[PDB]
Amino acid sequence: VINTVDTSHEDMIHDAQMDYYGTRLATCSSDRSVKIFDVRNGGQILIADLRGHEGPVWQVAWAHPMYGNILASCSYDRKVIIWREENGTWEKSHEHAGHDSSVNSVCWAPHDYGLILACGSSDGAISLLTYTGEGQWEVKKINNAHTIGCNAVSWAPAVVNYIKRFASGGCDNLIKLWKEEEDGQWKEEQKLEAHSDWVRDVAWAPSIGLPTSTIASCSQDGRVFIWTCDDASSNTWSPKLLHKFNDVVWHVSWSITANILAVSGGDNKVTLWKESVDGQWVCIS
Amino acid sequence: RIIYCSSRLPPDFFGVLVRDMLHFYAEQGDVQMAVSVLIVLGERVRKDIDEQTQEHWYT
């Protein structure tokens, strides 16, 4: 079925992500506002209209319900705002202004890792807002993460204490994979370089228990790659060109089982890709 | 019975497993079970086991 939602925004939409339970939808636009709808039973209830940003809001990311109703938003105004809902209302809860350029993407860490939000800014700085209770956040900034500027950040699923890894894609035409050391410092470990233009969105594939790590990354030119790592010990990623697009590709999103990829590009077209038995990704839409 | 006398499984999904079961029963001296299965199944597994081994089991 189709549940069409009228955003009622004052400008073009830049992202739209529903909650973990799939009941509440939060959208962001250039109108400096974030609207959280209630799309249960195909409804439209404007639960809140959060306006705390001085610039356009790029990406929103719900948190796991294990930590409560938490929404994160990154905006062009160098400002990261975390909205937590309490007593039936959505209100500003935490404020982050550690970046000197526009924060492009926010992606919450898996709930096993705790309550960690990774932000990527256009200045090449990556900040991880670890949460330690009592309503304070500690920031472990990864300075100079990318030469020109980080565009997207995606976390690696908890795989077996816990080794925390995430993928970053910047404007330096490359993908950087990060892991924290034993002390806590985050050190670059492997560099991925196959895109001929800006890496706009890197998205890890959620793990289902398979011994294979998959990364889908889109680029400014229009190249979408599938970075498979069949052997964890080898830690070698072999890119596979999913498709060559005539325009820019903006966002890539995996399924819950990581078998269907939602490739959305600048041509105002949304394509669903499923891997065939022959190893070639074929469009479904 | 379930495998043979039955958005579905591949048609020849269990052929390798049936051959392995036949060889497992034959290699431990239970040629009776292997021959009985071969006769009951007939052509469903006959084309998968080579003629020489089938003749050896039958004899």
Binding site: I13, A262 | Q28
Partner: protein
């Protein structure tokens, strides 16, 4: 503003379990569309509702799972569940002495069957069926070197791959939680190998108990469930509005 990326006007994202949140440039703001894609995924919410996992009885659970799969319309699932019904029979339990008989795991219809089915549904990326099989065939599992090797060889689930099976169960539990079946998620997660006197009845309380944070008087859970459905103060007469001051 040279290094900032160009603003996105269209995007697609998988949200929830079987929903796709894609918005497009209008070509006055865009339009956000939520499309149900439960048919695209290899897992079924209805199957998750209908599957049961009773450790005590495995044949009954396999039979009900086959019936539910037929109700949904998965012929392969019906066949696999009937195969599990046959292959998880309690009369096939391995003996402690390796010299008595060949274990059913060494039989090609045992461990080899299970490995083939798991490989096929890993190719299909069916976390549901993978977790279901790895729980059904684990519930049945509930000189010295040879004995240890026989113990390792008498299990239809490979001991050297228990991490993968636990990952299957954890991923399916997360999927069930995403759907909203907390009871089903807790039921599935139980198969993972790696993990005061009542103020009303005045009987010692040792099982489930509710104790108010404000005052500290409580007891058996059912007793407070019955008592607070009508009254509002603490049953010991302390006057604490326990429902208002504890159910935060």
């Amino acid at each position: 503003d040279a290094n900032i990326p160009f603003p996105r006007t269209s995007g697609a994202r998988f949200c929830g379990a079987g929903y796709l949140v894609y918005f497009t440039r209008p070509m006055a703001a865009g339009k956000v569309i939520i499309q149900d894609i439960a048919c695209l995924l290899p897992v079924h919410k209805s199957l998750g509702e209908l599957y049961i996992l009773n450790v005590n009885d495995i044949q009954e659970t396999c039979q009900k799972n086959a019936a539910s799969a037929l109700l949904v319309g998965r012929k392969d699932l019906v066949q696999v569940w009937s195969l599990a019904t046959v292959a998880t029979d309690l009369c096939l339990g391995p003996k402690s002495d390796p010299d008595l008989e060949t274990p059913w795991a060494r039989h090609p219809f045992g461990r080899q069957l299970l490995e083939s089915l798991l490989a096929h549904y890993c190719r299909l990326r069916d976390v549901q069926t993978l977790a279901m099989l790895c729980s059904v065939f684990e519930a049945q599992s509930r000189r010295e070197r040879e004995r240890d090797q026989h113990d390792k060889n008498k299990r239809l689930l490979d001991p050297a791959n228990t991490q993968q099976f636990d990952d299957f169960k954890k991923c399916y539990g997360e999927i069930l939680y995403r759907w909203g079946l907390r009871e089903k998620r807790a039921e599935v997660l139980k198969f993972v190998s790696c993990p005061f006197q009542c103020a009303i009845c005045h009987v010692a309380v040792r099982g489930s108990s509710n104790f108010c944070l404000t005052c500290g008087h409580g007891g058996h859970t059912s007793h407070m469930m019955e008592w607070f459905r009508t009254q509002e103060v603490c049953p010991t007469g302390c006057g604490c509005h326990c429902l208002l001051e504890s159910t935060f």
